[PDB]
Design an enzyme around this catalytic site. Structure first.
Site: not given
Ligand code: CA
Lengths: 58, 223
Positions: B40, B84, B175, B177-178
């Site tokens: 995402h 994801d 902020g 994410s990932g």
């Protein structure tokens, strides 16, 4: 104006920091908010212009 | 990261910042040419920033490299958030040092109770917003899948794992994410989603990296 324009900005469940625009009914204009990256609601635009065109009313 | 602490300078050398004008997601360096993040976090253009501590100040240890290839998992579902995960090939190999280093992929799936380190430059508040200049850290355990499922009725797949606290108070946030969830030196999770941040009965949900080791290795070798 459309009902979704009157809803508060929705960050969503994802944790990214994506700057989007939403219509602030009280202020009478579009402002920025932090969108999480997924499952966006309708009061979420990629530009102030698109936001005002859709939610600015008349 | 809500309820965490400021990481010791460059104590998380595998942590990278994904930037497309402003910091928008995190990622982990897995080899000198590849970064793994969340699907995402996809954007057509991405600049990877390595060796960062203060994302708002040029410190002198940073490496800025553009994404040459951005490959999301073929089965990523943008609504359920299953699968994801995303890979980013750097336009040029980065220089490895004490401040820019790789993190190992899982040797196998870590069991519930395993303590891990979550990091990122996301919001530090559960209510309101505060984007930190300095990289934040959080020590948290992988939660039993049964507790994860109880917290998120019908929304947890086998490719997801909850990490955090059922009582809330500490969690990853927008902020982050990932970003990485590292346990015993291995990347076991990727910051993905959750309802709010640090809320009771809603710990963060993370992509279970151990299910994608082969996909990652095969993808890197083919690109
Ligand atoms: Ca910096």
């Amino acid at each position: 104006r459309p009902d979704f324009c009157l809803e508060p900005p929705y960050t969503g469940p994802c944790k990214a920091r994506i700057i989007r625009y939403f219509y602030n009914a009280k202020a009478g204009l579009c402002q920025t908010f932090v969108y999480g990256g997924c499952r966006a609601k309708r009061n979420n635009f990629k530009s102030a212009e698109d936001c005002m065109r859709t939610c600015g009313g008349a | 990261i809500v309820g965490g602490y400021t990481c010791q300078e460059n104590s998380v050398p595998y942590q990278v910042s994904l930037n497309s004008g402003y910091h928008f997601c995190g990622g982990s360096l897995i080899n000198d040419q590849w970064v793994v993040s969340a699907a995402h976090c996809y954007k057509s253009r991405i600049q990877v920033r390595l060796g960062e501590h203060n994302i708002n100040v040029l410190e002198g240890n940073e490496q800025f490299v553009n994404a040459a290839k951005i490959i999301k998992h073929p089965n990523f579902d943008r609504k359920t958030l299953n699968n994801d995960i995303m890979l980013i090939k750097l336009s040029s190999p980065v220089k490895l040092n004490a401040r820019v280093a790789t993190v190992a992929l899982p040797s196998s799936c870590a069991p519930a109770g395993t303590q891990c380190l979550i990091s990122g430059w996301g919001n530090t508040l559960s209510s309101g917003v505060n984007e930190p200049d300095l990289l934040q850290c959080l020590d948290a355990p992988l939660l039993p899948q049964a507790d994860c499922e109880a917290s998120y009725p019908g929304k947890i797949t086998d490719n997801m794992v909850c990490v955090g606290f059922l009582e809330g108070g500490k969690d990853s946030c927008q902020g982050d994410s990932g970003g990485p969830v590292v346990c015993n030196g291995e990347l076991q999770g990727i910051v993905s989603w959750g309802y709010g941040c640090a809320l009771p009965d809603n710990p963060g949900v993370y992509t279970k990296v151990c299910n994608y080791v082969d996909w990652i290795q095969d993808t890197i070798a083919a690109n």
